[PDB]
Structure 1
C-alpha cells in the first residue's frame, strides 16, 4: 500500500561507479532483535551465490559476508550502525573498483572488498524489519 513489499527483489546490473540507494524506515523496533538485510545475489533465485550480504542488527552491529555454493566465507563486522528507530534512513552502497562502500545518511560506515566482480551481481534483495520506500541503482 504505502511501501514496497518486504522481502523485495530487484534485478540489477552493477558497474564501477554504480550506487544502490535504499530508502526505508526501521519498524518493529520494540522487538528483541530488529534487523535489516541487503543481499547482492549472482542470480535470480535465493539459492544462488551472494556476493555481499549486509545484515544490520539495529542498535548493535552489522555483519557482512559472501556465500559461494551454500558456504559462507570470512565474516566482517562493525558496531557503527547509525540508524534511528522510526526515522527514515538513506542507505547507499557505492560500487568502487575495489570495494562496496556503505554509507548511512551520508556517512561511511564500512567498506567491503570485492570477492567476485560486482558485474556478477544480478539481483538485490532487501529484507527484515524495515518499511521500504524506494530502491534505485544510480550511475
Structure 2
C-alpha cells in the first residue's frame, strides 16, 4: 500500500540548489516491465510545458525529454538504471545551475541540461508503477 496517491501531483517552487527526493517501491517485478515517471511541469495543468520528463523502464533503460510549446523535443537516454527488483529505491533530482542531476540510490546516472530555467517548474508529478513512501523538496 502506497503512503501517497499515484499519480502524485506536488506543487513546487524550485531554485538552483533544490533537491527532490522520491522514495518508493516498484509494484511489479522487473520481468513484467514496470515503469516509473517523473515530470517537472511548468503548471498544474498536465498539458503545460515540461522542463524535464524522466521515464524509467526498470531493468532496461531511462528515456528523458522535454516539451516546449506543446512539442516534444529530442529524446535522451541512458542504460544505467541501478534499481533493485522489488526493493525500495531513493531517487534524487538535484537542480544545479546547468542541469538536473539524477541519482538512483546515491548513484549519479545522468545530467539533463536545462533548456528553460528550473524556477519555471511549478509542479512535480510522480507516476506509473510504484508505491510512493515519501516525496521531499529540500534546499
Q: Normalization by structure 1: what TM-score?
A: 0.96
Deviation of 1:32 after TM superposition, in Å, equals: 3.4
Q: Secondary structure at the match of 1:65?
A: strand
Deviation of 1:33 after TM superposition, in Å, equals: 2.4
For 1:29 and 1:70, the matched residues in 2 are separated by: 34
Q: Secondary structure at the match of 2:119?
A: helix
For 2:66 and 2:136, the matched residues in 1 are separated by: 22
Q: Which stretches in structure 1 are left out of the alignment for 5+ residues? A: none
Deviation of 1:30 after TM superposition, in Å, equals: 5.7
* 1:23 correspondence with 2:15: no
The equivalent of 1:53 in structure 2 is: 53
The answer on whether the counterparts of 1:26 and 1:84 sit within 8 Å (CA) in structure 2 is no
The answer on whether the counterparts of 1:39 and 1:125 sit within 8 Å (CA) in structure 2 is yes
Deviation of 1:2 after TM superposition, in Å, equals: 4.5
For 1:30 and 1:36, the matched residues in 2 are separated by: 12
Aligned length: 139
For 1:120 and 1:128, the matched residues in 2 are separated by: 24
The answer on whether the counterparts of 1:40 and 1:121 sit within 8 Å (CA) in structure 2 is yes
For 1:129 and 1:85, the matched residues in 2 are separated by: 13
